[PDB]
Nucleic acid binder design. Structure first.
Lengths: 258, 123, 60, 226
RNA sequence: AACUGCGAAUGGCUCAUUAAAUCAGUUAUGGUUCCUUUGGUCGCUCGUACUUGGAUAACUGUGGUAAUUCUAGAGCUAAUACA
RNA sequence: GCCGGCGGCGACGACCCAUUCGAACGUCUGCCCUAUCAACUUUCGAUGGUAGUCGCCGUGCCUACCAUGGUGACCACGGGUGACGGGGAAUCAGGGUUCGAUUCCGGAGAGGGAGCCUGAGAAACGGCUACCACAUCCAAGGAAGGCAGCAGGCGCGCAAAUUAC
């Protein structure tokens, strides 16, 4: 069609939001921002559907327009603003801080953090370039362009940024025997340790990840995010420890709890 | 003979609300009107029945139970601000103007055909 | 576009041969024994059983 | 044929009904914005030279300045052209426009008095005119009153006296836009402040990276000794 | 009320066209544009400023045509419009 | 507010780089019937080469000068389609056959063609300009058109709802 699309049909929305069929015809339609439309989360969904604070669409803008909600220590009134992976949502009214981490089954989970941990965030560097009198530059997965990076930071490494400033505190290299998390494909939300990468020139690089419970799986390089140094994570994990336990013991656990 | 229970509560500081799921047990009589639910809930939470708002009561098949949504505001000012107009109009705190969509959209399309201050004159 | 589902399913299968003694008897015995309204209610239970049996057969 | 005569000096205008060929033969075969000596009109017009500014033909179509014809013509009119105002942005319409050359076949002719004559024609020159509003821009007020930079403008701003039945009189003045106020100076020093912040930011970042890179290339060189 | 900014290229409808075309799965832009959002950049240039200029709407007043969301002439006045 | 200057919190802007939403050109593999369609394309670009032009860019996209190529019984080219293409639907042992205008995705067009203004984005039709076909008002001078948006009406036919809030 002519020009860009403005709407989004409800059934055409990405599955990990878990919008039901009958509520309406349209969906939230995440607006342009740091994270991709397919792999983000509108605040209207997070507030209304996940935290169960707002009932209707009006209550969400009535919350947001009173400027009670910050994303990465910055006030956002846009109810369809895309907050994606590693983004820290802060409610300073009720003093509640959330980090958006994918759960085992492959969706953003309502994972609370201490206010002391809502100071920094981890970020995967997309590229590294230099320009105009050679001040080198870095670009990350949440589109934060940072000047004068540490020259030890190469492409596909992770960096820890203080949210109040815009400067790198510490960084993790992408090497063998490092804790990573999958952010795309069948294995989305699984945490594990790198074993090796198999470089395919002129094509996608494939990496092999071993889980804590002896489960080994492969994934594309683009869908990898280093979260810890060695085996120890630099952030809190969700309810489960990123362990994909199968339907058999899912049933056994559920029936055991009953 | 009516018993009021509350199911999922929440202290919504973000909208200055206490929001909850109302369970009404009325075995013999008909579906209890909203005003009696309001005052009995207001008595239960030790507040004015003016600052209480209840809706969406679906009486179960057989007629032993009725489930609905309730919310109590911290003060009537926050209630006046945050609550939608349709739920004020039932309490009688808001008045709607007696004009149809046909009438206002008609007058709009007539008002298009004149330029200047005469737009207000066409009525 | 409308916010409605069109997920509707038939719950009974009619017999292949419409008039067949031995069958009609067997259905009328079932009605007579369990006071069912019409032969739709017998076909309903046959259809549900058949689907359970087909699920068991394709699992084996 | 009628004459829509206006006097800009007094700001008065009258519609005259002239139905005598002799009085209009002076005006015929003349273009727009042409100075014509209005004598044949009547006695009162002794020393009046008048300009032809517009008018409408018997169908009511107006005439443009630049159309060097007699009858009407179809012109694709865009933004800027007279006898047209667009409804949408960059939206053009083909419309019937009368030729700039005047003839006998005109419903009205629009006349503007450029100069006087001996005595005032009743309708126009007798009655006073008041151009009601004045000077909103500070420099316009200064240019009007010839005030030097030391002199204030709010003191010599225009005051509009306004009175209506069943209410005491009011004197209203306009919000003088483009006037230097402490607020504007504060915005200007607020603008110049950030420039100092950005330069010290660049210098401190560069200095920090220089100290970082120094040890980085020192340790990078150290391992090259092997 | 009007000038200015933005939107009106989405949505909705229908299936005439269309046979390696449309379209589907897979890859490429190292061969290109991109409103908007989100980051970066914005005294890095060595040469009246304590704020410069002109107009036009709106409004008032005189009009034309049988006729339309038609518009000409006259008198003022704004800018994040135009310079 | 601090000792006549120096300032905090925003909002509009902004050359350019990154990003998001895209869009546009491509790569490989895949489509119904027809030989009573067997050779087709290249005068007026067909296939390729060099140089430009034009375009947001790659390119016969276009111009100039050269080469004589490119596709085809593994079905080209031509004709037909009561042909928009998929995700799907009905039926059903296994294999299959038939349907898919129709709510999600992509394409197309606003009676038929053609040309363009504005804009980041349109060859836009609830934007304009012309012609072709229909047709409204009229003082006969001129003026104004676009339901395959929602209702509703006429026609067409075996075949399809309320000028509602």
């Amino acid at each position: 069609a002519r020009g860009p699309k403005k709407h989004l049909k409800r059934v055409a929305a990405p599955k990990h939001w878990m919008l039901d069929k009958l509520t309406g015809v349209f969906a939230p339609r995440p607006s342009t921002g740091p994270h991709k439309l397919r792999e983000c989360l509108p605040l209207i969904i997070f507030l209304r559907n996940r935290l169960k604070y707002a009932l209707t669409g009006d209550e969400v803008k009535k919350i947001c327009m009173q400027r009670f909600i910050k994303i990465d220590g910055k006030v956002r009134t846009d109810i369809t603003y895309p907050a994606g992976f590693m983004d820290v949502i802060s409610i300073d009214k009720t003093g509640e801080n959330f980090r958006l981490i994918y759960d085992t089954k492959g969706r953003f989970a309502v994972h609370r953090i201490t206010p002391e941990e809502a100071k920094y965030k981890l970020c995967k560097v997309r590229k590294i370039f230099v320009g105009t009198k050679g001040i080198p530059h870095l670009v990350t997965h949440d589109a934060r362009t940072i000047r004068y990076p540490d020259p030890l930071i190469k492409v596909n490494d992770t960096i820890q940024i203080d949210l109040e400033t815009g400067k790198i505190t510490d960084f993790i290299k992408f090497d063998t025997g490092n804790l990573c998390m999958v952010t795309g494909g069948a294995n989305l939300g699984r945490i594990g340790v790198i074993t090796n990468r198999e470089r395919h020139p002129g094509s996608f690089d494939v990496v092999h990840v071993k889980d804590a419970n002896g489960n080994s799986f492969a994934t594309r390089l683009s869908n990898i995010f280093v979260i810890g140094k060695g085996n120890k994570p630099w952030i809190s994990l969700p309810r489960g420890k990123g362990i994909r336990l199968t339907i058999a013991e899912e049933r056994d656990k559920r029936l055991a709890a009953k | 003979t009516v018993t009021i229970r509350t199911r999922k509560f929440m202290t919504n500081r973000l909208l200055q609300r206490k929001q909850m799921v109302i369970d009404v047990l009325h075995p013999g009589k008909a579906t209890v009107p909203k005003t009696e639910i309001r005052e009995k809930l207001a008595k239960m939470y030790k507040t004015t029945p003016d600052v209480i708002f209840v809706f969406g009561f679906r009486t179960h098949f057989g007629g032993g139970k009725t489930t609905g949504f309730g919310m109590i505001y911290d003060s009537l000012d926050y209630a006046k601000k945050n609550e939608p107009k349709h739920r004020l109009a039932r309490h009688g705190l808001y008045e709607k103007k007696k004009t149809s969509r046909k009438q206002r959209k008609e007058r709009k399309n007539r008002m298009k055909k004149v330029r200047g201050t005469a737009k207000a004159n066409v009525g | 576009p409308v916010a409605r589902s069109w997920v509707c399913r038939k719950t009974y299968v009619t017999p292949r041969r419409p008039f067949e003694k031995s069958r009609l008897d067997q259905e009328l015995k079932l009605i007579g024994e369990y006071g069912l309204r019409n032969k739709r209610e017998v076909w309903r239970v046959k259809f549900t059983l058949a689907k359970i049996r087909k699920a068991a057969r394709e699992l084996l | 044929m009628k004459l829509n005569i206006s006097f800009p000096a007094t700001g008065c205008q009258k519609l005259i009904e002239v139905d005598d060929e002799r009085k209009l033969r002076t005006f015929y075969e003349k273009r727009m914005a042409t100075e014509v000596a209005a004598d044949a009109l009547g006695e009162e017009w002794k020393g009046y030279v008048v300009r032809i500014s517009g008018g409408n033909d018997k169908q009511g179509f107006p005439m443009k300045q630049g159309v060097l014809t007699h009858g009407r013509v179809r012109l694709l009119l865009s933004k800027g052209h007279s006898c047209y105002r667009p409804r949408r942005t960059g939206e053009r319409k083909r419309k019937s426009v009368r030729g700039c050359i005047v003839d006998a076949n005109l419903s009205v002719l629009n006349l503007v008095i450029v100069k006087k004559g001996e005595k005032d024609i009743p309708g126009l020159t007798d009655t006073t005119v008041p151009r009601r509003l004045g000077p909103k821009r500070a420099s316009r007020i200064r240019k009007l009153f010839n005030l030097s930079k030391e002199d204030d403008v709010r003191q010599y701003v225009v005051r509009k006296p306004l009175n209506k039945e069943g209410k005491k009189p009011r004197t209203k003045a306009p919000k003088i836009q483009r006037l230097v106020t402490p607020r504007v100076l504060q915005h200007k020093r607020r603008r110049i402040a950030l420039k100092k912040q950005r330069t010290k930011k660049n210098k401190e970042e560069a200095a920090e990276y220089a100290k970082l890179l120094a040890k980085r290339m020192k340790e990078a060189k150290e391992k090259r000794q092997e």
